[PDB]
């Protein structure tokens, strides 16, 4: 139900550029009829991809009935298959499966929401730069990936396994990450042989422009990283008011991308992107940059992130939230689809 053709994507066996979304939410929801419904409103906007975290990281456990997916301690780190563990992401699987959306689902973050990399680092010491080469830090987090992996191998609703949400090794040699990123893909592929694998990197390091996202400084190279023979697809991240660009970078960010993606034989996929303000018109200009290039390198894009209204209300809205049924979802949800369905096969 999700492979790669080239440069292109197949879902549900039709080859062409993908919209979708980021809900980081989602799987951490106790409420099945807050993830039925979101599901609903994500599919009826014709989205087919949905980028999910599938971690849930804590060095101590939390109160009451409060999700966690994984506790990590120097010794007798447990992960949590119980009703408040990874049942709650069995659920979003199963409920996807039966709306027909495509899970991406990052395996750690680089970031500390949801523990990160730093709640490995304070249970297994080192620094985040060398977590990528803590020895017990990576026996867990392997530990931890079979834990997740081998519960939805079967199932065909998984878009892609991603190994990180974002993952940086500042000022380290971008051989560690590719190195990294070689073995661990290797090893989700010895898990599961059929599905999707990718990095979820930004995509920082690469020709174009001379601009901070495009050096090395970040740990990654994404041309090299390209090479890793069970990495399908490449990602990029666009958050230009972060990163010291005007948003008239966007276009030539998402060309070079997609210009290496061609050159590896593999497609592209924006994988997150938002900026603050005057946000129709800005990631209108993005997005049409990105399906423009639908048969040169870039075969999806998801925007970050998805919002709605749950029993428990609306959801957060951290500046980058695009709610269902807004103005602002017409813009960047509805005439982005319509665009889509009207590109040349």
């Known amino acids: 139900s999700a492979?790669?053709?080239?440069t292109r994507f197949v879902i549900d066996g039709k080859t062409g550029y993908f919209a979708g979304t980021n809900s980081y939410w989602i799987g951490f929801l106790t409420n099945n009829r807050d993830v039925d419904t979101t599901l609903d409103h994500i599919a009826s906007s014709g989205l087919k991809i949905l980028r999910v975290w599938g971690f849930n990281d804590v060095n101590n456990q939390?109160?009451?009935?409060?999700?966690?997916?994984?506790?990590?301690?120097?010794?007798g780190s447990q992960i949590n298959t119980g009703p408040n563990g990874?049942?709650?992401?069995?659920?979003?699987?199963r409920s996807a499966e039966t709306?027909?959306?495509?899970?991406?689902i990052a395996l750690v973050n680089y970031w500390?929401?949801?523990?990160?990399?730093?709640?490995?680092?304070?249970?297994?010491?080192?620094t985040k730069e060398s977590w990528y080469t803590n020895a017990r830090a990576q026996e867990q987090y392997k530990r931890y990936i079979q834990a997740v992996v081998s519960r939805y191998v079967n199932s065909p609703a998984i878009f892609a396994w991603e190994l990180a949400n974002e993952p940086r090794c500042k000022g380290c040699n971008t051989n560690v990450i590719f190195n990294w990123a070689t073995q661990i893909s290797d090893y989700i592929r010895s898990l599961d042989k059929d599905h999707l694998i990718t990095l979820g990197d930004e995509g920082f390091g690469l020709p174009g422009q001379t601009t901070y996202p495009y050096q090395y400084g970040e740990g990654t190279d994404?041309?090299?990283n390209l090479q890793?023979?069970?990495?399908?697809?490449?990602?990029?991240?666009?958050?230009?008011?972060?990163?010291?660009?005007?948003?008239?970078?966007?276009?030539?960010?998402?060309?070079?991308?997609?210009?290496?993606?061609?050159?590896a034989g593999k497609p592209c996929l924006l994988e997150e992107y938002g900026y603050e303000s005057?946000?129709?018109?800005?990631?209108?200009?993005?997005?049409?940059?990105?399906?423009?290039?639908?048969?040169?390198?870039?075969?999806g894009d998801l925007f970050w992130q998805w919002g709605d209204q749950l029993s428990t209300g609306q959801t957060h809205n951290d500046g980058f939230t695009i709610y269902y049924g807004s103005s602002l979802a017409t813009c960047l949800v509805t005439d982005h689809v319509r665009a889509i369905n009207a590109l040349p096969a």
């Open 99 to 104: 709306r027909g959306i495509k899970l991406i």
């Open 112 to 126: 500390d929401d949801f523990g990160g990399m730093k709640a490995y680092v304070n249970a297994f010491g080192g």
């Open 228 to 263: 890793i023979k069970n990495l399908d697809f490449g990602t990029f991240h666009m958050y230009p008011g972060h990163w010291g660009v005007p948003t008239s970078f966007g276009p030539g960010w998402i060309k070079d991308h997609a210009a290496a993606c061609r050159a």
């Open 3 to 6: 492979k790669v053709s080239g």
């Open 278 to 299: 005057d946000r129709c018109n800005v990631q209108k200009g993005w997005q049409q940059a990105s399906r423009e290039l639908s048969r040169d390198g870039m075969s």
């Open 86 to 93: 990874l049942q709650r992401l069995d659920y979003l699987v």
């Open 62 to 75: 939390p109160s009451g009935n409060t999700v966690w997916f994984q506790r990590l301690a120097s010794s």
């Open 222 to 224: 994404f041309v090299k």
